[PDB]
Motif scaffolding. Structure first.
Motif, mmCIF file in Angstrom:
data_model
loop_
_atom_site.group_PDB
_atom_site.id
_atom_site.type_symbol
_atom_site.label_atom_id
_atom_site.label_comp_id
_atom_site.label_asym_id
_atom_site.label_seq_id
_atom_site.Cartn_x
_atom_site.Cartn_y
_atom_site.Cartn_z
ATOM 1 N N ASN A 20 0.815 -1.216 0.000
ATOM 2 C CA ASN A 20 0.000 0.000 0.000
ATOM 3 C C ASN A 20 0.851 1.271 0.000
ATOM 4 O O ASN A 20 0.480 2.279 -0.607
ATOM 5 C CB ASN A 20 -0.946 0.034 1.198
ATOM 6 C CG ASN A 20 -1.973 1.162 1.093
ATOM 7 O OD1 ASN A 20 -2.877 1.109 0.257
ATOM 8 N ND2 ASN A 20 -1.834 2.187 1.938
ATOM 9 N N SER A 53 -8.038 8.522 -4.971
ATOM 10 C CA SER A 53 -8.579 7.861 -3.798
ATOM 11 C C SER A 53 -8.924 8.873 -2.717
ATOM 12 O O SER A 53 -8.051 9.608 -2.265
ATOM 13 C CB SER A 53 -7.561 6.847 -3.267
ATOM 14 O OG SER A 53 -7.925 6.345 -1.987
ATOM 15 N N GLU A 55 -10.551 8.600 0.992
ATOM 16 C CA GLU A 55 -10.974 7.684 2.044
ATOM 17 C C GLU A 55 -11.245 8.397 3.357
ATOM 18 O O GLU A 55 -10.658 9.437 3.640
ATOM 19 C CB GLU A 55 -9.920 6.609 2.256
ATOM 20 C CG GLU A 55 -9.719 5.697 1.066
ATOM 21 C CD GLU A 55 -8.656 4.655 1.331
ATOM 22 O OE1 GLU A 55 -7.464 5.035 1.386
ATOM 23 O OE2 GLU A 55 -9.015 3.464 1.496
ATOM 24 N N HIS A 87 -7.456 5.515 5.343
ATOM 25 C CA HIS A 87 -8.710 4.846 5.670
ATOM 26 C C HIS A 87 -9.044 4.949 7.173
ATOM 27 O O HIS A 87 -8.150 4.932 8.027
ATOM 28 C CB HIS A 87 -8.642 3.381 5.217
ATOM 29 C CG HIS A 87 -7.625 2.561 5.947
ATOM 30 N ND1 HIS A 87 -7.836 2.070 7.219
ATOM 31 C CD2 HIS A 87 -6.391 2.134 5.582
ATOM 32 C CE1 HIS A 87 -6.779 1.379 7.608
ATOM 33 N NE2 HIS A 87 -5.888 1.404 6.633
ATOM 34 N N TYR A 113 -13.542 6.531 -5.353
ATOM 35 C CA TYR A 113 -12.448 6.220 -6.288
ATOM 36 C C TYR A 113 -12.805 6.556 -7.752
ATOM 37 O O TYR A 113 -13.969 6.413 -8.145
ATOM 38 C CB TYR A 113 -12.065 4.732 -6.199
ATOM 39 C CG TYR A 113 -11.936 4.167 -4.790
ATOM 40 C CD1 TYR A 113 -10.822 4.447 -4.009
ATOM 41 C CD2 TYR A 113 -12.914 3.346 -4.255
ATOM 42 C CE1 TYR A 113 -10.687 3.934 -2.735
ATOM 43 C CE2 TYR A 113 -12.792 2.815 -2.971
ATOM 44 C CZ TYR A 113 -11.672 3.114 -2.217
ATOM 45 O OH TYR A 113 -11.530 2.614 -0.942
ATOM 46 N N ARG A 141 -9.366 -1.294 1.584
ATOM 47 C CA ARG A 141 -8.964 -1.733 0.264
ATOM 48 C C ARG A 141 -8.217 -3.057 0.294
ATOM 49 O O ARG A 141 -7.988 -3.655 -0.754
ATOM 50 C CB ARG A 141 -8.116 -0.635 -0.419
ATOM 51 C CG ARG A 141 -8.955 0.562 -0.912
ATOM 52 C CD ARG A 141 -8.120 1.679 -1.569
ATOM 53 N NE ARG A 141 -7.143 2.233 -0.640
ATOM 54 C CZ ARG A 141 -5.853 1.922 -0.649
ATOM 55 N NH1 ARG A 141 -5.385 1.087 -1.568
ATOM 56 N NH2 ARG A 141 -5.033 2.465 0.251
ATOM 57 N N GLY A 145 -10.587 -3.522 -2.791
ATOM 58 C CA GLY A 145 -9.802 -2.611 -3.609
ATOM 59 C C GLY A 145 -10.468 -2.332 -4.943
ATOM 60 O O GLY A 145 -10.862 -3.279 -5.645
ATOM 61 N N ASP A 147 -9.286 -1.463 -7.682
ATOM 62 C CA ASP A 147 -8.279 -1.593 -8.741
ATOM 63 C C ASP A 147 -8.793 -2.134 -10.081
ATOM 64 O O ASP A 147 -8.300 -1.742 -11.152
ATOM 65 C CB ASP A 147 -7.147 -2.500 -8.259
ATOM 66 C CG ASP A 147 -6.502 -2.012 -6.971
ATOM 67 O OD1 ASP A 147 -7.238 -1.686 -6.002
ATOM 68 O OD2 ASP A 147 -5.250 -1.967 -6.929
#
Length: 566
Positions: A20, A53, A55, A87, A113, A141, A145, A147
């Motif tokens: 991360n 991102s 959060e 987060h 996101y 995530r 996640g 992604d």
């Protein structure tokens, strides 16, 4: 969960932290919200893509102290920049790997996101509500996640909401203002924030899709049923569940007392005194003790969780479920938006772990009376009518002289997932504008890529497509890895995120820009249909008749003399 998987998890947790960090960039950005400015960060993915991102965006007041057990309140605005580059903690819950309580009461956040903060056209907004029986889960995530999704040109949002008794305590006494469903009311306020702010992130507020899996599917359905959210979003996807699943609601008004008693409360059963005890108790103590609340009678009758969505006993301003879910479908605004529903090809294969600790459960199929819907069965499950309904279940799933574990897991597919889907479709047909509903069946089996639920269900080296197996192709998790672009796994990531984003954009899930959908004619279900058709998603995409149909109808036959209860 075994010591080996504990240490294995510990190590992947350590790996995930360093990954991360490595995948973070110095490109920070600031967006407007109606509550003040928020600072987000650009991040990388292992497929060499990148995304903005945000959060730890608060959508509600921290529900601590006097706000505990209560409906959520709108958060306080700030004038400055809120750091949303990290987060926030998850709802207080038992960790399934470690078994220790983790999380915090300060958990009411959402994450936003997108690959492009400044798109040239406003994008489809996808809102994910996680499952976990309403007692576990998170928008971190390392489990969910974004992604894969950020390869597509959407805005993706993952919310949190209060779990367990802190989320779903319910008291009869109208003076106390704990009617229940706080965690669902959390979901509502997050929706309203999403409606009113998604435009600042490139999101189109007139094209919002809510979707969820398991308890998140039930939640998504609840968000489609309640008057509280009317017109808020425009598409729904129900993945392996809905609000008329038998685990998806419960009358838990008496169980507050039990929990208090388990936690050290001395005194009488009256709501006021019980509440005051629970209000001062340590949140971890309450959550740790939730496992013990259900009686043996309740477990026998397949009551799965002590606290969850409930019919609120009196109506308040923020009331979410004023009648039983079956009754709410008859007036649901959500009946008239494009809907997609589906299940995996072996849902009940999930229950292997539980079967291994309780072999005796397989003997339940000898008469199957414990699996007769509660509303139809008698208290002791001994009435001749009950044995008769039980027999219709037995004929549907028991294949030989003596019932097997596979018979059991097959039954559970229907008890927990297919039969409630069938009841909802038919009920919905009687009260709708005629918006389409599409059915899918996820039938893709791989052990090369997995998600953490396989650890929980002890699914190591087990063939077949269990409940939660599809999450692996929607979200990155800390057990994932980069897959070759030609692999069957990667292709399915493309197909799944492709169809979901196709459905989110147009309300129609078909596209010939998706590899393998060349000869697919994906029709919605009609009320005239005796047999459901679904897109079956395996290595190939094939439209078929729902294979579970015959058993589905056998379950329906239990209501022959009770059609009004269907």
């Amino acid at each position: 969960v075994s010591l080996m998987e504990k240490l294995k998890w510990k190590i992947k947790c350590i790996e995930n932290k360093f990954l991360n960090y490595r995948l973070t960039t110095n490109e920070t950005v600031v967006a407007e919200t109606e509550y003040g400015k928020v600072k987000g960060v650009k991040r990388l993915t292992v497929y060499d893509d990148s995304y903005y991102s945000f959060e730890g965006i608060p959508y509600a007041q921290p529900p601590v102290g006097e706000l505990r057990f209560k409906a959520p309140q709108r958060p306080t605005p700030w004038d400055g920049v809120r750091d949303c580059c990290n987060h926030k903690d998850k709802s207080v819950q038992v960790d399934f790997i470690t078994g220790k309580v983790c999380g915090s009461e300060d958990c009411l956040y959402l994450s936003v996101y997108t690959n492009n903060l400044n798109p040239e056209t406003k994008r489809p907004v996808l809102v994910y509500i996680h499952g976990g029986g309403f007692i576990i889960g998170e928008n971190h995530r390392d489990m969910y996640g974004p992604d894969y999704f950020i390869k597509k040109d959407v805005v993706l949002i993952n919310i949190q909401y209060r779990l367990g008794a802190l989320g779903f305590l319910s008291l009869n006494s109208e003076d106390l203002n704990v009617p229940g469903n706080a965690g669902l009311k959390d979901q509502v306020m997050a929706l309203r924030w999403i409606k009113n702010n998604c435009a600042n992130f490139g999101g189109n507020p007139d094209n919002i899709t809510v979707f969820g899996e398991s308890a998140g599917a039930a939640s998504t359905h609840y968000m489609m049923l309640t008057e509280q959210t009317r017109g808020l979003f425009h598409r729904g996807i129900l993945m392996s569940g809905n609000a008329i699943c038998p685990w998806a609601n419960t009358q838990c008004q008496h169980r507050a007392f039990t929990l208090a008693k388990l936690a050290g409360y001395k005194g009488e059963d009256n709501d006021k005194d019980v509440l005051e005890f629970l209000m001062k108790a340590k949140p971890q103590d309450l959550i740790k003790l939730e496992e013990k609340v259900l009686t043996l009678e309740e477990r026998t009758n397949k009551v799965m969780f002590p606290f969850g969505p409930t019919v609120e006993p009196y109506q308040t301003a923020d009331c979410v479920l004023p009648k039983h879910p079956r009754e709410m479908v008859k007036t649901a605004w959500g009946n008239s938006i494009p809907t997609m529903m589906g299940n995996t090809s072996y849902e009940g294969l999930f229950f292997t772990s539980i079967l291994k600790q309780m072999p005796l459960l397989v003997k339940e199929l000898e008469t199957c009376v414990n699996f007769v819907p509660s509303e139809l069965a008698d208290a002791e499950r001994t009435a001749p009518e009950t044995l008769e309904m039980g027999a219709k279940i037995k004929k549907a799933h028991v294949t030989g002289e003596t019932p097997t574990a596979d018979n059991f897991m097959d039954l559970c597919s229907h008890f927990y997932f297919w039969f409630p889907m069938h009841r909802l479709l038919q009920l919905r047909f009687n009260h709708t504008s005629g918006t389409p509903v599409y059915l899918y069946r996820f039938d893709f089996d791989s052990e090369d890529l997995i998600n953490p639920y396989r650890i929980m269900r002890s699914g190591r080296g087990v063939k077949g497509v269990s409940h939660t197996d599809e999450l692996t192709y929607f979200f990155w998790n800390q057990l994932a890895k980069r897959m070759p672009k030609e692999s069957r796994e990667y292709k399915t990531i493309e197909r799944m995120t492709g169809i979901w984003t196709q459905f989110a954009t147009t309300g129609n899930p078909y596209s010939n820009e998706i590899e393998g959908m060349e000869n697919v004619s994906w029709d919605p279900i009609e009320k005239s249909d005796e047999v459901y058709k679904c897109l079956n998603i395996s290595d190939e995409l094939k439209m078929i008749d729902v294979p579970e149909m015959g058993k589905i109808k056998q379950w329906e036959s239990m209501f022959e003399k009770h059609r009004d209860l269907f």
